[PDB]
Write a protein that binds this ligand. Sequence first.
Ligand SMILES: *[C@@H]1O[C@H](CO)[C@@H](O)[C@H](O)[C@H]1NC(C)=O
Ligand SMILES: *[C@@H]1O[C@H](CO)[C@@H](O)[C@H](O)[C@H]1NC(C)=O
Ligand SMILES: [Ca+2]
Length: 181
Amino acid sequence: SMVLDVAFVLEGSDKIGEADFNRSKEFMEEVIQRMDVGQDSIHVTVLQYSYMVTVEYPFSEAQSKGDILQRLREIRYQGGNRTNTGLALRYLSDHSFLVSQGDREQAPNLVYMVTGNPASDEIKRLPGDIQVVPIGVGPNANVQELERIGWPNAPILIQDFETLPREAPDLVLQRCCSGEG
Ligand SMILES: *[C@@H]1O[C@H](CO)[C@@H](O)[C@H](O)[C@H]1NC(C)=O
Ligand SMILES: *[C@@H]1O[C@H](CO)[C@@H](O)[C@H](O)[C@H]1NC(C)=O
Ligand SMILES: [Ca+2]
């Protein structure tokens, strides 16, 4: 009944580290489990980023909850020496959300992006047909950058990675899905 194209983007840099990445992955998996994901409803794509952007699941592969969860359970922390948030945002606009890559023109493009550090590269807000909700986590997230990305809405700010998988899934569901889930 809910027709949305949802991207999750997780920072996996050396500064995040493996344990906090695992907490971000748990956050993502909980949300996916609770969303109405499926062939004719919510579609999911997933990026992990640091220096480079890794497509962990594209819109063009099977949009079935089981297939998505299996793959996401199998993928792992990538590490890396930058937080190239701008590169990741450009990737969403230039590739992830193209109709040629499985985007549906009529389904709103929503992004939930978890970051814990200031960007290493240049940040500009994406063209507005892409709605980005940044989730800043811990004391080194740059609030002004996240406001720029997320305008007109406030970023979701989470105190630390321990708190992320316990508080953030409800917050995302409130935004995407009227709190149903
Ligand atoms: C992260 O999760 C993976 C996959 O379950 C596990 O093998 C690994 O030990 C975890 N790492 C940390 C630091 O918790
Ligand atoms: C940082 O990561 C990049 C991309 O993998 C790599 O080319 C470069 O050597 C790394 N920098 C250092 C100082 O190791
Ligand atoms: Ca779309």
